[PDB]
Structure 1
Amino acid sequence: PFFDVQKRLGVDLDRWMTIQSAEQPHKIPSRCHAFEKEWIECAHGIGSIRAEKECKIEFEDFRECLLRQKTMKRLHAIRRQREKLIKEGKYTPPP
């Protein structure tokens, strides 16, 4: 915040909803809770210039959980191969 009034007064006006690993009703966890927790703890207090390099591993994993781009690409690869074999008769799926 430009003027960090919240921290000066110790009052929580909107911090409670900034991240998905914060406290949630009935302890319902977000899907990427562990990934966001890891990235936040890696980058805590060292500043964003340092974190962009030193916490790239945690952030890449968290981004993978968020949008699953690498997982979908892998699934697309296996499916495409399976169609070829079905189109060539070299594979019959089990039951």
Structure 2
Amino acid sequence: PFFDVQKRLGVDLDRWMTIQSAEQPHKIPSRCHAFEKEWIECAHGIGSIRAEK
């Protein structure tokens, strides 16, 4: 069962390496970077079960 402690208290275990656009230390992008901030913007307040459709 997924407890998600790193939500409650403060630490970051991972959460940074996770997706294709976060930091990239010197601020250098990926190729398809610009489509992430597009696609995450879509499904967030969604509950993901209607996201697919």
Q: Same fold (TM over 0.5)?
A: yes
- What is the number of residues matched between the two proteins? 53
Give the structure-2-normalised TM-score.
0.85
Structure 1 stretches of at least 4 aligned residues deviating more than 6 Å after TM superposition: none
Query: TM-score if structure 1 supplies the norm length?
Result: 0.51
**By how many angstroms is 1:45 displaced?**
2.1
Q: Structure 2 unaligned runs (5+)?
A: none
SS in 2 for 1:17: coil
Change beyond 3 A, Cα 1:10–1:50: farther
Give the superposition deviation at 1:3.
0.8
Pick the structure with greater CA Rg.
Answer: 1
Aligned to 1:27: 27
Q: What RMSD over aligned residues (CA atoms) do the two structures have, in Å?
A: 1.4
Q: Which runs of 5+ in 1 are unaligned?
A: 54-95
